[PDB]
Ligand binder design. Structure first.
Ligand SMILES: Nc1nc2c(ncn2[C@@H]2O[C@H](COP(=O)(O)CP(=O)(O)OP(=O)(O)O)[C@@H](O)[C@H]2O)c(=O)[nH]1
Ligand SMILES: Nc1nc2c(ncn2[C@@H]2O[C@H](COP(=O)(O)CP(=O)(O)OP(=O)(O)O)[C@@H](O)[C@H]2O)c(=O)[nH]1
Ligand SMILES: Nc1nc2c(ncn2[C@@H]2O[C@H](COP(=O)(O)CP(=O)(O)OP(=O)(O)O)[C@@H](O)[C@H]2O)c(=O)[nH]1
Ligand SMILES: Nc1nc2c(ncn2[C@@H]2O[C@H](COP(=O)(O)CP(=O)(O)OP(=O)(O)O)[C@@H](O)[C@H]2O)c(=O)[nH]1
Ligand SMILES: [K+]
Ligand SMILES: [K+]
Ligand SMILES: [K+]
Ligand SMILES: [K+]
Lengths: 306, 306, 306, 306
């Protein structure tokens, strides 16, 4: 169908501008920011200024009540842009003023409109403050009762992965490729009418377990490309504690060429029910694309972290 | 006469699309799917969308009540396509949303219309979930009180047969030739007016014992082609436990050229009377086809597994 | 936006004389002096004479009540010039007549007009008098209850830094670059739309803690330019006791080219939360300027010295 | 501004005729004498005769009451010539008839007109008598209750300084240069608008401590030119007992070229506050003149000798 990504705040808009000018199929991007200076120079072709009568183009400050109230009084503006959609993604970095407050408001618009919403957040760095981590912890409660799926990319685990003195654009961009793989992973799943076919309906029942989520795409090629793709797709090194045990909903998609083997299918599916052996449901897909070469792809969604 | 195969669900349509573009004699195929994306690219010349007002062309999800209710409200649509027929086969992969629910509904249409129906199901893989096997076990009860003859091709026994790293298409396509052999075995029995002519009269009284069924066709050629055909046709490697002891209905068809020996018939009949020695009826047949070579064919139907 | 520096007294006018004829972007300068003899020859093209009916172009003497009452009666002139501004800096040298009295009055105009004001004072030399330091100590109370942020450049610590027999102009001119760095550092922070973006909103919430402040910009270039910039920006050698422990508000801006690294980022920020680990808020910024070379800049503002 | 020096008596006329025909900037001189014989031949272009109806142009004799009465009855003429001025200096040699009487009357005119007045006196020689020294002390007591600042050049200390058999004219011209240096130091204090700037206000509030005063200018050039100039400025060899301890008001002006060093200022101020460490106010100035050479000038005013 058609899908949308609403990235609120300046950091959420930073995820959007990378996605613009790529080859995009059936996806439109909306930028939300209380502060209008960040929306001045962006590659995204549409911009939304929220709280223009309450800030006149400025941010939310260190008090997120300014960012919460600015989005609250422009709830008329959020509903109009969210039309004709059935999957929205909330891109933000929690811990600040706007993204801590405005992102639940877009979720509140999303939940009021009967749409399936998934929020992607980044918990801040530890050195930037521990007192400000407290309301960032309470900001999770602000998002735990309004969003079906909590995607978290904590910044305290940013240095432990590729700690070779990478660029600040690169480690920020690594979290962006998590969300881009999340957006493109759902998009390639539903749009493609494979030999076996998963669409929106069994997508919807997976992350309705109301818990923490994790969704990324592992790509492998080789003789044992099935185990390398299954283990890469389940590995999310950019989280504090993934806590795969006690999950309540699993969604697996398999993509391979016409040389796809039952040994390849089982060994991807062999590692998925080891932690999902509890009283929980697992949805499995399969796709057979003839034009693309021997590269294999596995997309895994795991929601319901209890 | 004229026969029909109604394959519900996306996987059931995959069984149907295998049978298209072959040489077809007096057989029509109808494709049933709640999800309309799988019906977009199929070789079958006619498509039926069920639940179009309840899903807008989407699936049934992990809850099979959506698949059951979508088929229930289009019972007006199921009766119209099932007309002028006297043998329908229900092709589905059980354990999901639609095939768990919609296949009993097509059976309920079939039973209400006074037609002889046999349902072919595939119990899911063990790694895909054991909790979802529980309602798949209750899904057997959903089909045990609406279908005369239960055909099961469990996916847990897919590995033990030709486990040489076969393709996912090949392991799935093996079960489709089981149903194609089931359809073509009945059709070649009925359409041919051989030297001995089995027809509708003895066919109906065999599988009306209201139990599990098994329908395969063994082909052998050689000096002892009788025992190789009889033992292949009685062996169904794609089932959990065939349980041939305690059967209540046996239907046997023998096909050979004019060089047929009376010892060829007896030894095929000898291995069938061994396990059918209980208080049960056995129907046998004979065919004398002059044009075809020394290749011999044996079709055995065993319904009433108790 | 547009910002203003209000420099009262003759010495405060000397601070204004330094910044006139430089390349100025969005900043206007207003000169205040009760004594009109120092305003006779100034490089600034605009002047304000306060107390012309009470002194006729003369100073305030050793009694600052003359300097206080001269500004108090001409409060009509101070409000008219302070229009369309959102950030004013009070440049004065305390301990005299006018700057001891008139600078709180401009603050009183600033506080009445709903503007964010920071007052910058220089405590006098120790040899010029200790009795006159007593009301200069009491002049701190005169400014502690009217200005959000107290910037102090004491003259008793002037000799301990670059005590190589520097010029009187150079020892005085060092304190003017404290102001020029303070004014330009806030100016370059907001006027630039960086890749990450700070503006007035989180600026405003930092120094509203009603305490002593410190504002300097450390510039480093090299292999370990992160630690050299962070330690230079946190070091203010021109104060009595900086007292970083017990701060209530921190504002940090980071400027680098597109080769910016994580190992640059935390190592700047690691020295900031060592003393700001108490129950206080910390704001971090970041800018990515492509045109400029490998030189790196760090601007730190720390208000709320308790 | 514009300043005046009122010189009563023959010694005052000698001081005035010494200052006339020099290069004069903004200064006017008025010559007062009860005896017109000294006013017969003077280089000053304007003359005032007081007591012309009481003496017919003769002196006051050995009784100062005659000069006091003459000045009292020509107070009407005294008031008219003192107009438009803000600084007057009383030049007289005490111990005689006219100056001992007329100078307190000019002081009374100055105090009645709201002007800043400082009196310069010369206590007479010891060999001329001690009975007249008694009423010289009485005249000092008379002038102590009418003049803000008492400048004394006693003649008993005239021989102790440069005692190489100098002429009487040479010692008289030395005292005249003391008074001229006082007047001219005040002149280029108020007239010059230096980089730092002293004006009339702190001047007015310094010598209002109502005590003995001292006003001299020390000039030095060299490597340690600060200490030599400051010690020459503080040394007044032409007084009985300078009594720097217990002062109540200090006024210092510093003049140097653009090569002025901080250490010069430190050493000058350091040798000022040693005797000015009591509960007293110190006013410190600075000037930066670019055209003149490496010569340095220090002007020190110390009023309030207690
Ligand atoms: N990992 C990243 N986190 C970010 C980035 N940008 C912001 N953030 C996080 O977002 C938080 C601050 O965002 P704000 O709530 O202030 C949204 P704001 O309106 O201030 O954006 P702008 O004013 O447009 O810069 C803070 O905790 C940061 O850790 C980024 O590029 N990467
Ligand atoms: N052996 C096979 N089993 C299958 C195949 N396709 C599906 N299935 C089984 O069917 C079950 C899921 O089918 P569904 O009830 O969801 C019918 P659905 O409307 O979802 O089909 P589509 O949405 O058109 O793909 C699941 O338990 C699978 O094990 C197949 O090609 N081979
Ligand atoms: N560090 C510096 N302190 C100064 C400077 N100029 C003045 N001051 C300080 O300011 C105080 C005196 O300022 P005033 O109250 O007299 C203001 P005023 O009207 O007299 O200035 P002008 O009359 O124009 O010179 C005194 O304590 C000095 O220590 C300067 O150039 N540098
Ligand atoms: N140091 C100096 N003291 C003087 C000078 N002339 C006078 N005097 C002192 O002034 C005192 C006498 O001055 P008078 O009061 O008589 C003023 P008078 O009108 O009589 O001056 P003439 O009429 O010009 O003689 C006496 O004590 C002298 O010591 C002088 O040139 N230098
Ligand atoms: K799909
Ligand atoms: K037949
Ligand atoms: K900015
Ligand atoms: K001056």
């Amino acid at each position: 169908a058609v899908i949308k990504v609403i990235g609120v705040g300046g950091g959420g808009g930073n995820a959007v501008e990378h996605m613009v000018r790529e080859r995009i199929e059936g996806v439109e991007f909306f930028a939300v920011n209380t502060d209008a200076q960040a929306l001045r120079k962006t590659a995204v072709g549409q911009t939304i200024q929220i709280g223009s009568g309450i800030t006149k183009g400025l941010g939310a400050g260190a008090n997120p009540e300014v960012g919460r109230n600015a989005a609250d009084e422009d709830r008329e503006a959020l509903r109009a842009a969210l039309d004709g959609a059935d999957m929205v993604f909330i891109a933000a970095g929690m811990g600040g003023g706007t993204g801590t407050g405005a992102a639940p408001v877009v979720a509140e618009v999303a939940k009021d409109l009967g749409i399936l919403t998934v929020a992607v957040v980044t918990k801040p760095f530890n050195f930037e403050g521990k007192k400000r981590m407290a309301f960032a912890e309470q900001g999770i409660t602000e998002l735990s009762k309004h969003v079906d799926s909590l995607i978290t990319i904590p910044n305290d685990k940013l240095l432990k992965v590729l700690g070779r003195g990478i660029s600040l654009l690169d480690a920020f961009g690594a979290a962006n490729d998590v969300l881009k793989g999340a957006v493109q992973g759902i998009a390639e799943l539903i749009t493609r009418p494979g030999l076996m076919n998963v669409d929106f309906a069994d997508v919807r029942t997976v992350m309705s377990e109301m818990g923490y989520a994790m969704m990324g795409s592992g790509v492998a090629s080789g003789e044992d490309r099935a185990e390398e793709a299954a283990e890469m797709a389940i590995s999310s090194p950019l989280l504090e504690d993934i806590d795969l045990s006690g999950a309540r909903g699993v969604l697996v998609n398999i993509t391979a060429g016409f040389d796809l083997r039952l040994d390849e299918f089982e060994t991807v599916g062999n590692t998925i029910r080891a932690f999902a052996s509890d009283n929980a449901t697992v949805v499995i897909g399969t796709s057979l694309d003839p034009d693309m070469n021997d590269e294999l792809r596995v997309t895994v969604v795991a929601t319901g972290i209890g």
